mmCIF file of C-alpha atoms in Angstrom:
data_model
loop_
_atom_site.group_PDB
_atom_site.id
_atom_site.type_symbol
_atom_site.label_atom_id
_atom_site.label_comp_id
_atom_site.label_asym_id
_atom_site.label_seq_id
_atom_site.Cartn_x
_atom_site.Cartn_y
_atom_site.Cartn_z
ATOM 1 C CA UNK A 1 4.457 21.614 -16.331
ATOM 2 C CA UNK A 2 3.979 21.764 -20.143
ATOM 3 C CA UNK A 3 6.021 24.480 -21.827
ATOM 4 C CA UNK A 4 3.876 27.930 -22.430
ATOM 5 C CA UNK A 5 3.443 30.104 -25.785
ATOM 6 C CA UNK A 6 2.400 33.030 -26.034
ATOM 7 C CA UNK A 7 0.367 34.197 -29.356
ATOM 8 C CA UNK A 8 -2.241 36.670 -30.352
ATOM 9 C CA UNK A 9 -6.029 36.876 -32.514
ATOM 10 C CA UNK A 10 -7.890 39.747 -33.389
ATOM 11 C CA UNK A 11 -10.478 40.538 -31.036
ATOM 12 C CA UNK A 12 -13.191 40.177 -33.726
ATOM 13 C CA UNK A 13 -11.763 36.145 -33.771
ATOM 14 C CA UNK A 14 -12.861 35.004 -30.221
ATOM 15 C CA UNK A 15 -15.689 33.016 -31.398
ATOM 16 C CA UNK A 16 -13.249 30.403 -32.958
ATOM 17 C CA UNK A 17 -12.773 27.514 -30.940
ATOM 18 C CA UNK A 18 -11.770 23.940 -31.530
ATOM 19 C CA UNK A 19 -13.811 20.905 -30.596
ATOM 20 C CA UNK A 20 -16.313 23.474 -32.291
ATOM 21 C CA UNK A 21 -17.955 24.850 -35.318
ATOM 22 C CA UNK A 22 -19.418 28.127 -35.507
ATOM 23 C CA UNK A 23 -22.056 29.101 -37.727
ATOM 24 C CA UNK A 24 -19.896 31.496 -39.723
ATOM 25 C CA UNK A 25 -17.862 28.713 -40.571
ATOM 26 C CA UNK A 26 -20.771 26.650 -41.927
ATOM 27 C CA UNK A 27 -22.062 29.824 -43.919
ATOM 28 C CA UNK A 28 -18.476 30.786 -45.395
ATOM 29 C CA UNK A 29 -17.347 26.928 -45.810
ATOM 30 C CA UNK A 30 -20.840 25.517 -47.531
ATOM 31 C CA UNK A 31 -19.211 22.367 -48.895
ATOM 32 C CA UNK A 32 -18.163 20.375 -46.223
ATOM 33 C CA UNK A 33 -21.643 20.678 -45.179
ATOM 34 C CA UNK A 34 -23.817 19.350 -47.927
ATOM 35 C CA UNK A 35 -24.975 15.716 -46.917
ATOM 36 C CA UNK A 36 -24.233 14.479 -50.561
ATOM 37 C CA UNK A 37 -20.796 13.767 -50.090
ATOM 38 C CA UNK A 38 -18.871 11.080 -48.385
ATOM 39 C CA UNK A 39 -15.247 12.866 -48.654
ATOM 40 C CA UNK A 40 -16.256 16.219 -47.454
ATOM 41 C CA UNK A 41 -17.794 15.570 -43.734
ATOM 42 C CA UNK A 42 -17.534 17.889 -40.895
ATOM 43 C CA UNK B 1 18.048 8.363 -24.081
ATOM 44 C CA UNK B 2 14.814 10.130 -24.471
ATOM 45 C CA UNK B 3 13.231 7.042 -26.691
ATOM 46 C CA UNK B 4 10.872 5.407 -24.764
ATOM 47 C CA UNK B 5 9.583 2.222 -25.141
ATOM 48 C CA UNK B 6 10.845 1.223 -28.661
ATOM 49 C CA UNK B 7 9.855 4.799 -30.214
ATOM 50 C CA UNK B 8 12.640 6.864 -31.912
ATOM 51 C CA UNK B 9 11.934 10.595 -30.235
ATOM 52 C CA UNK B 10 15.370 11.270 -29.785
ATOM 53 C CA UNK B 11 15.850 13.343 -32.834
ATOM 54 C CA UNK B 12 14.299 16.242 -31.226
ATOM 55 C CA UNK B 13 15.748 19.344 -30.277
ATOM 56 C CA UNK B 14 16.802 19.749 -26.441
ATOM 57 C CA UNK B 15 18.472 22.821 -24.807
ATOM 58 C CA UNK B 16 -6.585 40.818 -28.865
ATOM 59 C CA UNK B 17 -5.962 38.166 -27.075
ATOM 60 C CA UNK B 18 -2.891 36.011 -25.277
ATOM 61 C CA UNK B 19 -3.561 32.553 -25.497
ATOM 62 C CA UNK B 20 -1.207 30.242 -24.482
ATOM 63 C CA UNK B 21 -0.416 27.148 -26.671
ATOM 64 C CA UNK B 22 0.843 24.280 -25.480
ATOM 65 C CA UNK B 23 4.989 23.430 -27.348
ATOM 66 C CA UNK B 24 5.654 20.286 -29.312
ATOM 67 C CA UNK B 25 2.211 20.375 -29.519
ATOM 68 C CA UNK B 26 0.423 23.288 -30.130
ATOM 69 C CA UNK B 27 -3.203 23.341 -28.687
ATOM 70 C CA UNK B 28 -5.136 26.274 -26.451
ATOM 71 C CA UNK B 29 -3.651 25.164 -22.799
ATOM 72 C CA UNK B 30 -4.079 46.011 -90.355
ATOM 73 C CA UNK B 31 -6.127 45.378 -93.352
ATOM 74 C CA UNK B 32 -8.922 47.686 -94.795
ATOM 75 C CA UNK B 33 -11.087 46.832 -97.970
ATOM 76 C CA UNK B 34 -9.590 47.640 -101.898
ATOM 77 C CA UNK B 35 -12.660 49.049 -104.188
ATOM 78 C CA UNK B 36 -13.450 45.813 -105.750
ATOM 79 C CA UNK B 37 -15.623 43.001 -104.118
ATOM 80 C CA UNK B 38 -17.182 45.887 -102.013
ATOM 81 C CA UNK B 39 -19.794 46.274 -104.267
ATOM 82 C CA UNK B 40 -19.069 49.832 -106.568
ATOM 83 C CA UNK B 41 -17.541 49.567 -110.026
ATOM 84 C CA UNK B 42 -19.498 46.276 -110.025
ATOM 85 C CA UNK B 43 -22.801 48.187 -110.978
ATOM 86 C CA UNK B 44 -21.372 51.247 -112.708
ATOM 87 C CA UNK B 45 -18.835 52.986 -115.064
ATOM 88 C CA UNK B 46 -21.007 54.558 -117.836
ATOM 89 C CA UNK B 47 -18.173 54.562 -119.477
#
């Protein structure tokens, strides 16, 4: 029912998905990982 | 016509890999020195 789109990713970019975080997110993003700060969560 | 329930959404316009997003909301469906001052003729000139 919802109207469709239609758009394209790389093949090497099938790992991203929402609702999730993939490790090479948390090892090319380190800040919003550290546990010091209250601003910067996940 | 299309505001529902007290909210103003009329102002809206009506009319690899292939993922399909969901519309109106899109989600997965110089200078140098002079002689002096550099130290010659200022120990010198037997004359």
């Amino acid at each position: 029912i919802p109207q469709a789109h239609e758009i394209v990713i790389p093949s090497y970019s099938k790992w991203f998905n929402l609702e999730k975080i993939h490790s090479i997110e948390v090892q090319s993003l380190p800040e919003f990982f550290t546990n010091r700060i209250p601003s910067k969560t996940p | 016509x299309x505001x529902x329930x007290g909210r103003x959404x009329x102002x809206x316009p009506x009319x690899x890999x292939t993922x399909x997003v969901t519309x109106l909301x899109x989600x997965x469906x110089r200078x140098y020195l002079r002689f002096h001052x550099x130290x010659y003729x200022x120990x010198x000139x037997x004359x």
